[PDB]
Amino acid sequence: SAVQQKLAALEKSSGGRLGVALIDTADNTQVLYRGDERFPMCSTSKVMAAAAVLKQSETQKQLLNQPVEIKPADLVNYNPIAEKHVNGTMTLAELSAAALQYSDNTAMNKLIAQLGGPGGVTAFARAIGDETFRLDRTEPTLNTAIPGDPRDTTTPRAMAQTLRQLTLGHALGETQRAQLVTWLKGNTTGAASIRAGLPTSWTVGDKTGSGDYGTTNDIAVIWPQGRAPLVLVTYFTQPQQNAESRRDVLASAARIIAEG
Incomplete structure (x- = not known):
């Protein structure tokens, strides 16, 4: 298709490896580019940890207000x-917000501990039907992004489907889903990424x-x-261990998709 040709050209121009998945909820159509290849999640894994804690709060109604102590030894990078x-x-609500909206790594490690380790985050993914997501390590080593290493990876297709379930579907209770949506909408780190390639009114x-x-x-x-909502996942990685971030590639991929 035309969109796939333009994404392939973008990838060629960038020198890296790009993965894209779009779900259009209007007709449940999908657009995929390297949709079944594994990519390192890095901090995008924080959505699954926060959602897992939200799922626990459906039975433990006061869980999000529980205080958690921040000690100097808890701080990472x-x-x-x-x-x-x-x-x-x-509180667990404040830690979830920090993990999601500021990408706070200590906050993520407290969420992982609440779930009983990385295996507890992975378990939640399995429970909502994601057989692809795997979280293996804590912060900060889950970000090593070594080529070929399956640890702490997912595929664009799997993450798009899971993000759809969590935010627009019913994998979470109604209060929990609305809280997740509110947190994501208030992210502070995304201005130069997908948002930069989309119309300013979206x-x-x-x-x-x-x-x-x-x-x-x-x-x-x-x-x-x-117009009906869309779910868009853009993953990008490069061959050099010390390569600089390329948020412009994510913006450009969003722009190419939005053209459709």
């Missing part, structure tokens, strides 16, 4: 919110990710004005 609360507490909720090998990711739910 990037903790923009957790650092403001060292030797204090944050509402977007997204989660970015970045890691070694110039890995640059973004997953988004998109509500166009007077």
Whole structure:
């Protein structure tokens, strides 16, 4: 198709490996580019950890208000919110918000601990029908993005379908789903990624990710004005261990898709 030819040209121009999945919820049609190849998730994995904790809160009604202690030994490499609360507490809701909207890595590790380790995040993916997602490590080593390594990867097709379920479908209870949507819409890290390639009047909720090998990711739910929502996943990685991030590639891929 025309869109696939333009995505292939974008990929060639970029020197990296690009994976795209679009789901148009108007007719459940899909557009895929390297849709079944594995890519390192990096921080896009934080959506699954937050959703897993939301799922626990359907039975444990007060769970999101539970205080969790932030100790100096909890801090890892990037903790923009957790650092403001060292030797204090944050609730699981505040940690979920920090993980999603500021990509706070300490927040992610507390969410993983609440679920009983990476195996508990993976379990939730299996429970909602995602057989592809795997979380193997904690922050910050899940971002190593080594070529060929299956750890901490998913495919664009699998993540688009799962993000659809979580935000527009009914994998979560109604209060939980609405909370997830509100968190994603208030992301602060996405201005140069998928959002930059879309009309300024469209509402977007997204989660970015970045890691070694110039890995640059973004997953988004998109509500166009007077038109059914779309789910768009863009993953990108590069051959050099020290490559710079390429958020412009994600913006350009979104623009090519939006042209359809």
